Amino acid sequence: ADTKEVLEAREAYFKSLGGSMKAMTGVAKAFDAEAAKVEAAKLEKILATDVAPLFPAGTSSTDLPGQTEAKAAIWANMDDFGAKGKAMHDAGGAVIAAANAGDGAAFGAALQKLGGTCKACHDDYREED
Numbered sequence: 001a002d003t004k005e006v007l008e009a010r011e012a013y014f015k016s017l018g019g020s021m022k023a024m025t026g027v028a029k030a031f032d033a034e035a036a037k038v039e040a041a042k043l044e045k046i047l048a049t050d051v052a053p054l055f056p057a058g059t060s061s062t063d064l065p066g067q068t069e070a071k072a073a074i075w076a077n078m079d080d081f082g083a084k085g086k087a088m089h090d091a092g093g094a095v096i097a098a099a100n101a102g103d104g105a106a107f108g109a110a111l112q113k114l115g116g117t118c119k120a121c122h123d124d125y126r127e128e129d
């Protein structure tokens, strides 16, 4: 769809994930089941977003330099890109489950995994400007 709005939506989605990731890191080093649960609820809403519509062809950093960090490589590795997003969803579920179960150790560990899923995709698909 309209590059402007799709770029806006795409940026909103990832910024919210980044905020969520920051909040959860703070929670992990001084775990509290109540705080963990409010963060997991927020994450749960974010992951309910379908990102497919957010990456239409013609919106990479090559097409719109400076306007986005989405690498052209994404559109030639859609299956891989999709599998990496799926890994994030699965890791997110482990974090949420640990928050709901009030298990701090499981939360801390699930958090490491979630963080790894962000890096796995960023390493190949995000501009390291």
Ligand code: HEM
Pocket (backbone or CB within 6 Å): 007, 010, 011, 014, 015, 017, 018, 021, 067, 068, 069, 070, 071, 081, 082, 084, 085, 088, 114, 115, 117, 118, 119, 121, 122, 125, 126
């Ligand atoms: C893991 C939960 C995760 C985090 C955290 C995260 C954050 C993040 C931010 C903050 C941005 C910057 C947004 C901005 O413009 O200000 C960003 C950008 C991209 N990401 Fe990411 N991201 C997380 C996970 C993943 C996963 C699993 C994927 C790929 C399957 C992914 C991809 C990207 C891409 C591409 C961008 C650039 C987007 C753009 O500039 O339009 N991220 N991410």
Ligand SMILES: [Zn+2]
Pocket (backbone or CB within 6 Å): 011
């Ligand atoms: Zn941005």
Ligand SMILES: [Zn+2]
Pocket (backbone or CB within 6 Å): 032, 033, 034, 035
């Ligand atoms: Zn408490």
Ligand SMILES: [Zn+2]
Pocket (backbone or CB within 6 Å): none
């Ligand atoms: Zn208490």
Ligand SMILES: [Zn+2]
Pocket (backbone or CB within 6 Å): 047, 049, 050, 051, 085, 089
């Ligand atoms: Zn997703």
Ligand SMILES: [Zn+2]
Pocket (backbone or CB within 6 Å): 047, 048, 089, 090
């Ligand atoms: Zn999911």
Ligand SMILES: [Zn+2]
Pocket (backbone or CB within 6 Å): 118, 119, 122
């Ligand atoms: Zn990263």
